[PDB]
Design a protein around this ligand. Sequence first.
Ligand SMILES: CCCCCCCC/C=C/CCCCCCCC(=O)OC[C@H](O)CO
Ligand SMILES: CCCCCCCC/C=C\CCCCCCCC(=O)OC[C@H](O)CO
Ligand SMILES: CCCCCCCC/C=C\CCCCCCCC(=O)OC[C@H](O)CO
Ligand SMILES: CCCCCCCC/C=C\CCCCCCCC(=O)OC[C@H](O)CO
Ligand SMILES: CCCCCCCC/C=C\CCCCCCCC(=O)OC[C@H](O)CO
Ligand SMILES: *C\C=C(C)/C=C/C=C(C)/C=C/C1=C(C)CCCC1(C)C
Length: 231
Amino acid sequence: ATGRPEWIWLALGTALMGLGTLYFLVKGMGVSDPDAKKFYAITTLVPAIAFTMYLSMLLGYGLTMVPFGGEQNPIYWARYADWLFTTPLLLLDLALLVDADQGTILALVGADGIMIGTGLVGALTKVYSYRFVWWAISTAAMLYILYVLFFGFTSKAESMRPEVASTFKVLRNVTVVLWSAYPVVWLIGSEGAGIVPLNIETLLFMVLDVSAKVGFGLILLRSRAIFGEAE
Ligand SMILES: CCCCCCCC/C=C/CCCCCCCC(=O)OC[C@H](O)CO
Ligand SMILES: CCCCCCCC/C=C\CCCCCCCC(=O)OC[C@H](O)CO
Ligand SMILES: CCCCCCCC/C=C\CCCCCCCC(=O)OC[C@H](O)CO
Ligand SMILES: CCCCCCCC/C=C\CCCCCCCC(=O)OC[C@H](O)CO
Ligand SMILES: CCCCCCCC/C=C\CCCCCCCC(=O)OC[C@H](O)CO
Ligand SMILES: *C\C=C(C)/C=C/C=C(C)/C=C/C1=C(C)CCCC1(C)C
């Protein structure tokens, strides 16, 4: 018996990420269109990275104890190593779908790195009140990203192939609804106010992670928008 009550959700998350990796890897076999190859490679790497980090949490490697509030608090730091590499890849899927300009992609990836990097600092900070200063900076970086996705990409997708505009609009709406939930769980969870216990928080993140990575990929890779217009 594992002593951590949240282990059942880490085990399920590891299995779904693994099955998602294998499904995408087999579906991509034989795809020869170079454009589709780009989206298969980016989208298959997302669950493959998350699989190794969920496994590290399940085995206890990606966990550490952070003193704050007079209590040793168990912080899963492996979540941020996961998100550092998977969240910019998800943004690249959207940016390449709309043929975004290079300067915009750099702005998105750079703000994404600030978002995850300050969230890591906030999770490891020992002065309790300062943890919410880093939460606020990270959340401001996210709001810059959400703005670009609505008032920068949407304007350009509408001037492209109808299948690209329709698929982008769906993946854009999914992204904004799912990404906006992460700061709320972090704030009321063990990393912040501590109102939700760690076992329920782990359940919430696992549902969000699978929907935002596997659910996101199932919508993208079944669409014709990833293929170049050909006869
Ligand atoms: C798509 C099909 C799948 C649908 C799945 C979506 C569900 C997402 C998970 C939700 C939160 C549930 C958390 C369980 C509630 C536990 C809270 C509780 O009862 O705590 C009691 C405490 O002892 C006294 O307050
Ligand atoms: C039980 C199963 C557990 C889950 C599996 C273990 C994951 C770790 C292993 C391998 C990395 C394999 C390669 C990952 C890179 C995939 C990129 C890709 O396939 O892109 C296709 C593109 O079209 C090509 O040009
Ligand atoms: C397109 C870009 C593709 C990017 C592909 C990158 C995927 C790498 C994945 C995983 C291993 C992560 C391991 C992180 C190493 C942490 C080890 C550490 O520093 O631990 C310190 C201390 O010993 C204990 O707390
Ligand atoms: C956590 C930090 C590490 C991970 C961060 C991920 C950043 C990935 C790199 C670059 C974006 C630079 C612009 C790349 C966009 C090029 C798309 C394009 O416009 O087409 C040109 C392309 O060469 C086809 O011809
Ligand atoms: C645009 C989409 C993304 C937006 C993301 C930003 C949303 C920030 C929301 C709320 C602050 C609410 C804070 C409430 C925390 C109070 C906890 C507390 O101290 O109360 C203890 C508890 O009530 C005793 O049981
Ligand atoms: C792999 C799945 C997704 C959708 C991951 C998204 C992560 C975030 C939106 C993280 C947000 C954070 C902020 C803005 C503030 C608290 C710390 C976080 C890093 C969790």
